């Protein structure tokens, strides 16, 4: 097995890809990233006991939230356009833009390269403008992916 090791946020590289083509969507200037797979847990008790008897996973998702400080035209125009099309204005249709996401992080002392990938991430809300006096525009995304497609050491 591989020892646990520290990870330094500023070493990470995040990428967004179009799930139709695996072409990159230009995105940069990340500050914070949380990627958290989750399941709702049903935690089941009997008649005969005060203790738990069984516990079961059900609704799975991956919570993705990102804070970033370089605006991308492409990321926003793809989110407006929806799957497989790019737009300069809100679209009156029900399909959200699905993004694939990968985050790559060398560990702090070079023990491993933790690569995480997530499929079909979608964002209910896109901050277009996030202006504050005397500050750079800082944008926060909250969204949900369908599953974690990869979690592995990608070092040699």
């Amino acid at each position: 097995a591989t020892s646990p090791e520290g990870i330094w946020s500023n070493s990470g590289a995040l990428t967004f890809e179009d799930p139709a083509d695996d072409s990159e969507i230009l995105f940069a200037g990340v500050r914070d990233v949380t990627i958290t797979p989750a399941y709702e847990h049903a935690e089941l008790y009997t008649i005969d006991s005060t203790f738990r008897d069984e516990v079961k996973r059900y609704e799975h998702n991956v919570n993705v939230e990102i804070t970033y400080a370089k605006f991308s035209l492409e990321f926003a125009q793809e989110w407006l356009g929806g799957p497989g099309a790019t737009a300069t204005a809100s679209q009156d249709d029900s399909d959200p833009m699905k993004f694939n996401l990968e985050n790559v992080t060398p560990s702090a002392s070079g023990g491993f390269e933790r690569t995480t990938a997530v499929e079909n991430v979608v964002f209910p809300e896109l901050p277009l403008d996030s202006a504050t006096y005397g500050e750079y525009e800082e944008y926060s995304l909250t969204g949900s992916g369908r599953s974690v497609t990869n979690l592995a050491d990608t070092s040699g």
Binding site: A42, L44, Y45, D53
Partner: peptide, 12 residues
């Protein structure tokens, strides 16, 4: 049949 449920629900 397992008589098991979430939280404090009625079971029998």
């Amino acid at each position: 049949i397992p008589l098991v449920e979430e939280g404090g629900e009625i079971l029998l």
